[PDB]
C-alpha cells in the first residue's frame, strides 16, 4: 500500500511535468489509487484497519492526504477509525444533534476563561481529558474565533445608533484636554484585541518559521491569514503613532502654558493642529489610515470561518462548491482585465481632452474611466457617462458605440463564463467534502489552548496481516475476473 | 395586517398539488426554496462580514457623507442589502471631506462585496443546477397522493 | 410487505444515524422500497391491489407516505385506487377538462352558502353523498 501510494505521488508528479502524456500518466495514478482503495476496502476487523492506516499516528492516513488520495481519505472504513480518535475521550457528544453541539459551543464560549484558568489543575484532573480531546480543540478554537468577533463588533459599540457629535465639532473630556488624545487613546476593548491579534500573530510566526517561508506562502489561505493579521498590526501601529502625537501634544500643552482654559491660548500650529476636529485632519494623517486598515482587517476577519465550517455536514460541500468555482473564476478573471483594460484605456484616450467639457466626469482620467467601467459591470453607472456639452457627436457617438460594446462583452464574458463553470461541474462531492473534513479532523490531533491563551507557558504481526489482506485481495481479483469470463 | 394579507395568497400551495400541470411546478419551487436556505446562511455570513466592515469605517462620518448609508449600522445595512439588486447608487461611498483614503478603501470594500455577491449566486446557480440531478413524476404524485389522503 | 416497509423505516433512520455508513443503510432502504414496488406490481385484479393497499382504509398508503416510500405510492396500481376512491360518488366530473372543473368551483363558490344551509338536509339527501365525496371536500 506503501509503494502504490508513493508510486501515485511519482505518477502524478510526470503527470504534471510531461503535459504530452498527461491522461497516461493521470489514468496510471489513479490505477494506484484504486488498488489503494480496494485493498483498503476489504477490511473486516479494527485490527486489519489500523494496520493499513498505520505501518509498524496515522501515518498512512496522512500520506495520502499529502498526495491527494481522496477515496482513500473519505471511505467509511477510514471515517469510522478518525470519527473514533475525533471524540476521543467523550462518546456521548457524537449521537447529539447539531443544535446540543451548538449549545456545547456556546456553553464553552461562555465559561472559556474560567476552563482556561482551571487548566492548570486539569492534567490531575478528570476534565483535563475531556479538554485535551481532538474535538474539544477544534470547539474552543471556534468559540475563541467567535468571542473575538464578538470583540470586533463590541468595539464599534457607541456608534451603532450614529455619532451622537457631528464631525465638525470637538468634544473634551476636560478643557486642557487635546482632542487627538481623546479620539486616539486606546480603550479597554481595543487592548484585548491587540492582545488577540498579537497572540494569532505568535502562532502563525511559530508555524512559518517550523515550516518554512516558501511552502508556507505556497498555501494561498495561509497567505490571506498572514495578511489578515499584517493588516490588523499596521492599522494598531497607525493608532499607536496617533496615540503618541496626541499625548506629545499634551505633555507639551501641560509643559509650558498655565493658563485656566485652552481656547484662549495661541498654541503654535504643529500642537494647535492636534485641537482639531475631523474636517480639518490631513489626509494622511495616522489615525485614517488606522481607521482603514482597521475595516480591511475587519472585513477580512470574518474569512476565518472557512476553518469552521469544513465540519458541519450541510455547509461543507456548500465550502467545496465556492472554492471550486472561486478557484475557477480567476481564469476568466484575467481575461476580463484583457478586456476591461482594452476598454478603459480606448474610452480614456477618447475622453480624456474633455475634462470640463463632459457634463459628468466619468472617462476623462484615467481614474474615472477605471471607475465607471467597473461599475458598469453591476449597472451603478449612469448611461450619461458618454455624452457631451459640446455639439462634437462624432465623439459622443463613439462614445455610446464603445460603451455599449463594452456592455455586450461583459455580458458574453459572463454566460461564457457560467456556461463555462456549470460544465466543469461534472459521489465525487462526497468524498471530495469528507477529505476536506479530514484534513481539518487531521489538524487537530497533534495545538490545545486557543491563540490568545497560548502565550502562556514468524515475520511480524503487521506483515502478516499485510500478507492476509493482499492473499485477500487476490483471490477476490481472480473471482471477479473468472467470474466475468466464465464462458 | 398587511403582512397577514401577503402572506394569506400563500395557502395556494394547498390547491397547487391537486393540478396537473402546476404540481412538479410548486415540486421545484419547494426544491428550490429548500436548496438556497444552505447558500443563505453563507450570504448572511459574507453580508454580515461586509456590513460590520463598512459600518466601521463610515461610522465617524454621521455628516460628512454626502449619502448617509453606511454612518449607522441600520443604513448599511439597507445599503448592502439593496445593493444586491442594484437600487443602491454608487454614490454611498463618497465623502464631503478630502479624506480620500477612507473614500477609496470604501470604494475597493464596496466593490469586493458586490463581486462576492455574484461569486456566490452564480455557484448557488450552478450547484442547484447540477443538485437537480419520471423521479420528477413520481416525487408530484407522491405530493399530490398526500393532498389526496389529506 | 409490512416487514419491508417497517425495515426500510429502520434502515432510513440508522442512515440519518450512523453518517458513516450511510450510503450502505440507503442503498438497504432502498432495496427494501423495490421489494415493495415489485410486490404492488404483480397486481391483476383489484382484490390483490386493495389487499396491499391494505390488510385485514389505506393503511399501507399511509404507512408508506409516513416512511417516504415515493414509488409504491406513485405506482398506477395505486393511484387507480386513489383516483376511484378521490372522484367517490361522482365519477362523471373525472373525465372532463381542467375548465369545466374550474367552473365547479366556481359554482360551488357562488353558492357554497346556500349548500352549507341546505347541509343540514343532505344526510337524508342525495345531494349529501355528493357535497361528501373526498373532492366536493377539496372543491368546497
Ligand atoms: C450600440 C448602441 O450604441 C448606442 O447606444 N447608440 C449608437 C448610435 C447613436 C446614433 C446617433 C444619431 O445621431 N443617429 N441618427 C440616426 C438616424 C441613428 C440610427 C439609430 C438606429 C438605427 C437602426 F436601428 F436601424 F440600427 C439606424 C440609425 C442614430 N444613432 C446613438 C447611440
Ligand atoms: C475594485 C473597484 O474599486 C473601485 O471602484 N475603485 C478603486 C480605486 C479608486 C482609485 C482612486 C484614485 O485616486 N486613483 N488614481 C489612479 C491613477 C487610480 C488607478 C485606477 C485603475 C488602475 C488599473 F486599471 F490599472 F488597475 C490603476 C490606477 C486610482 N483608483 C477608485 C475606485
Given at each position: 500500500?506503501?509503494?502504490?501510494?508513493?508510486?501515485?505521488?511519482?505518477?502524478?508528479?510526470?503527470?504534471n511535468?510531461?503535459?504530452?502524456?498527461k491522461?497516461?500518466?493521470?489514468?496510471?495514478?489513479?490505477q494506484?489509487?484504486?488498488?489503494?482503495?480496494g485493498?483498503?476496502d476489504?477490511?473486516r476487523?479494527s485490527?486489519?484497519?489500523?494496520?493499513?492506516?498505520?505501518?509498524?499516528?496515522?501515518?498512512?492516513?496522512?500520506?495520502?492526504?499529502?498526495?491527494?488520495?481522496?477515496?482513500?481519505?473519505?471511505?467509511?472504513?477510514?471515517?469510522?477509525?478518525?470519527?473514533?480518535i475525533?471524540?476521543?475521550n467523550?462518546?456521548?457528544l457524537?449521537?447529539?444533534?447539531?443544535?446540543?453541539?451548538?449549545?456545547?459551543?456556546?456553553?464553552?464560549?461562555?465559561?472559556?476563561?474560567?476552563?482556561?484558568?482551571?487548566?492548570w489543575?486539569?492534567?490531575?484532573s478528570?476534565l483535563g481529558?475531556?479538554?485535551?480531546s481532538?474535538?474539544?480543540?477544534?470547539?474552543?478554537?471556534?468559540?475563541?474565533?467567535i468571542?473575538?468577533?464578538?470583540?470586533?463588533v463590541?468595539?464599534a459599540?457607541?456608534?451603532?445608533?450614529?455619532?451622537?457629535?457631528?464631525?465638525?465639532?470637538?468634544?473634551?473630556?476636560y478643557?486642557?484636554?487635546?482632542?487627538?488624545?481623546?479620539?486616539?487613546?486606546?480603550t479597554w476593548?481595543?487592548?484585548?484585541?491587540?492582545?488577540?491579534?498579537?497572540?494569532?500573530?505568535?502562532?502563525?510566526?511559530?508555524?512559518?518559521?517550523?515550516?518554512?517561508?516558501?511552502?508556507?506562502?505556497?498555501?494561498?489561505?495561509?497567505?490571506?491569514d498572514?495578511?489578515?493579521?499584517?493588516?490588523?498590526?499596521?492599522?494598531?501601529?497607525?493608532?499607536?503613532?496617533?496615540?503618541?502625537?496626541?499625548?506629545?501634544?499634551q505633555q507639551?500643552?501641560?509643559?509650558?502654558?498655565?493658563?485656566?482654559?485652552?481656547?484662549?491660548?495661541?498654541?503654535?500650529?504643529?500642537?494647535?493642529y492636534?485641537?482639531?476636529?475631523?474636517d480639518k485632519?490631513?489626509?494622511?494623517?495616522?489615525?485614517?489610515?488606522?481607521e482603514?486598515?482597521?475595516?480591511?482587517?475587519?472585513?477580512?476577519?470574518?474569512?476565518?470561518?472557512?476553518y469552521?465550517?469544513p465540519?458541519?455536514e450541510?455547509?461543507?460541500?456548500?465550502?467545496?462548491?465556492?472554492?471550486?468555482?472561486?478557484?475557477?473564476?480567476?481564469?476568466?478573471?484575467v481575461?476580463?482585465?484583457?478586456?476591461?483594460?482594452?476598454?478603459?484605456?480606448?474610452?480614456?484616450?477618447?475622453?480624456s481632452?474633455?475634462?470640463?467639457?463632459?457634463?459628468?466626469?466619468?472617462?476623462?482620467?484615467?481614474?474615472?474611466?477605471?471607475?465607471?467601467?467597473?461599475?458598469?459591470?453591476?449597472?451603478?453607472?449612469?448611461?450619461?457617462?458618454?455624452?457631451?456639452?459640446?455639439?462634437?457627436?462624432?465623439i459622443?457617438?463613439?462614445?455610446?458605440?464603445?460603451?455599449?460594446?463594452?456592455?455586450?462583452?461583459?455580458?458574453?464574458?459572463?454566460?461564457?463564463?457560467?456556461?463555462?463553470?456549470?460544465?466543469?461541474?461534472?459521489?465525487?462531492?462526497?468524498?471530495?467534502?469528507?477529505?476536506?473534513?479530514?484534513?481539518?479532523?487531521?489538524?487537530?490531533?497533534?495545538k490545545?489552548?486557543?491563540?490568545?491563551?497560548?502565550?502562556?507557558?514468524?515475520?511480524?504481526?503487521?506483515?502478516?496481516?499485510?500478507?492476509?489482506?493482499?492473499?485477500?485481495?487476490?483471490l477476490?481479483?481472480?473471482?471477479?475476473?473468472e467470474?466475468?469470463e466464465?464462458?
Amino acid at each position: 500500500v506503501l509503494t502504490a501510494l508513493e508510486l501515485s505521488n511519482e505518477l502524478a508528479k510526470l503527470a504534471n511535468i510531461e503535459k504530452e502524456f498527461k491522461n497516461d500518466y493521470r489514468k496510471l495514478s489513479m490505477q494506484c489509487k484504486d488498488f489503494v482503495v480496494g485493498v483498503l476496502d476489504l477490511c473486516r476487523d479494527s485490527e486489519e484497519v489500523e494496520a493499513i492506516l498505520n505501518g509498524d499516528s496515522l501515518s498512512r492516513v496522512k500520506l495520502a492526504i499529502k498526495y491527494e488520495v481522496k477515496k482513500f481519505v473519505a471511505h467509511p472504513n477510514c471515517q469510522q477509525q478518525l470519527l473514533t480518535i475525533w471524540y476521543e475521550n467523550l462518546s456521548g457528544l457524537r449521537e447529539q444533534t447539531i443544535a446540543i453541539k451548538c449549545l456545547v459551543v456556546l456553553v464553552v464560549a461562555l465559561g472559556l476563561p474560567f476552563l482556561a484558568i482551571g487548566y492548570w489543575i486539569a492534567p490531575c484532573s478528570r476534565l483535563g481529558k475531556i479538554l485535551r480531546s481532538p474535538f474539544m480543540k477544534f470547539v474552543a478554537h471556534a468559540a475563541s474565533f467567535i468571542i473575538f468577533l464578538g470583540l470586533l463588533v463590541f468595539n464599534a459599540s457607541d456608534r451603532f445608533e450614529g455619532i451622537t457629535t457631528l464631525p465638525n465639532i470637538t468634544v473634551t473630556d476636560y478643557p486642557k484636554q487635546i482632542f487627538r488624545v481623546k479620539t486616539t487613546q486606546f480603550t479597554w476593548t481595543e487592548m484585548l484585541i491587540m492582545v488577540w491579534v498579537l497572540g494569532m500573530m505568535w502562532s502563525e510566526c511559530k508555524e512559518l518559521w517550523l515550516e518554512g517561508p516558501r511552502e508556507y506562502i505556497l498555501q494561498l489561505w495561509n497567505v490571506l491569514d498572514f495578511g489578515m493579521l499584517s493588516i490588523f498590526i499596521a492599522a494598531f501601529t497607525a493608532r499607536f503613532l496617533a496615540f503618541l502625537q496626541a499625548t506629545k501634544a499634551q505633555q507639551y500643552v501641560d509643559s509650558y502654558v498655565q493658563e485656566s482654559d485652552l481656547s484662549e491660548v495661541t498654541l503654535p500650529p504643529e500642537i494647535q493642529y492636534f485641537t482639531y476636529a475631523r474636517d480639518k485632519w490631513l489626509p494622511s494623517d495616522p489615525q485614517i489610515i488606522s481607521e482603514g486598515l482597521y475595516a480591511i482587517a475587519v472585513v477580512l476577519s470574518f474569512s476565518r470561518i472557512a476553518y469552521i465550517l469544513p465540519a458541519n455536514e450541510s455547509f461543507g460541500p456548500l465550502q467545496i462548491s465556492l472554492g471550486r468555482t472561486v478557484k475557477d473564476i480567476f481564469k476568466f478573471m484575467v481575461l476580463f482585465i484583457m478586456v476591461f483594460f482594452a476598454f478603459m484605456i480606448g474610452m480614456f484616450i477618447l475622453y480624456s481632452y474633455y475634462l470640463g467639457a463632459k457634463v459628468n466626469a466619468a472617462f476623462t482620467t484615467v481614474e474615472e474611466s477605471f471607475k465607471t467601467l467597473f461599475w458598469s459591470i453591476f449597472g451603478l453607472s449612469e448611461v450619461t457617462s458618454v455624452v457631451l456639452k459640446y455639439d462634437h457627436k462624432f465623439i459622443e457617438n463613439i462614445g455610446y458605440v464603445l460603451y455599449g460594446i463594452y456592455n455586450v462583452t461583459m455580458v458574453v464574458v459572463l454566460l461564457n463564463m457560467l456556461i463555462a463553470m456549470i460544465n466543469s461541474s461534472y459521489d465525487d462531492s462526497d468524498v471530495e467534502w469528507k477529505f476536506a473534513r479530514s484534513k481539518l479532523w487531521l489538524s487537530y490531533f497533534d495545538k490545545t489552548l486557543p491563540p490568545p491563551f497560548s502565550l502562556v507557558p514468524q515475520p511480524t504481526r503487521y506483515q502478516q496481516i499485510m500478507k492476509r489482506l493482499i492473499k485477500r485481495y487476490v483471490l477476490k481479483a481472480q473471482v471477479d475476473k473468472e467470474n466475468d469470463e466464465v464462458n
